[PDB]
Amino acid sequence: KKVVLNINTDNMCNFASYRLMPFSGFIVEKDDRIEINDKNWFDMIWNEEYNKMRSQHDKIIENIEYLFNIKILSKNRIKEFWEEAIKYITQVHRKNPNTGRRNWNPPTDNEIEKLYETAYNTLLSLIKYDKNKVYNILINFNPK
Partner 1 sequence: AKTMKKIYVTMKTLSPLYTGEVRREDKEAAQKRVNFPVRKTATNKVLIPFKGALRSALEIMLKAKGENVCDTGESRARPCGRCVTCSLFGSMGRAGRASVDFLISNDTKEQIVRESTHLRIERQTKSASDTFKGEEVIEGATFTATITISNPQEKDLSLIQSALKFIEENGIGGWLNKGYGRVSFEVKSEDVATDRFLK
Give residues in contact with partner 1 (CB under 8 A). Answer: 30-32, 40, 43-44, 47, 51-52, 55, 99, 101, 105-106, 144
CA torsion angle 115 119 122 125 (round to 10): -130
Element (H, E) at 75: helix 75-82
Q: Which does residue 131 touch among a second copy, partner 1, none (CB within 5 to 8 A, set by kind)?
A: a second copy
Asked if residue 82 lies in contact with residue 138, where contact means CB atoms within 8 angstroms, the answer is yes
d(C-alpha 25, C-alpha 55), whole Å? 29
**Quick check: 132 binds a second copy (CB under 8 A)?**
yes
Give the residue from 28, 21, 22, 23 showing the smallest Cα distance to 44: 28
Segment 30 to 89, residues that bind a second copy, using CB under 8 A? 30, 34, 36, 39, 42-43, 45-56
User: Closest distance between a second copy and the C-beta of residue 58, in Å?
Assistant: 20
Which residues in this chain contact a second copy in the complex, by CB under 8 A? 3-5, 7, 9, 12-16, 18-30, 34, 36, 39, 42-43, 45-56, 91, 131-132, 135, 143
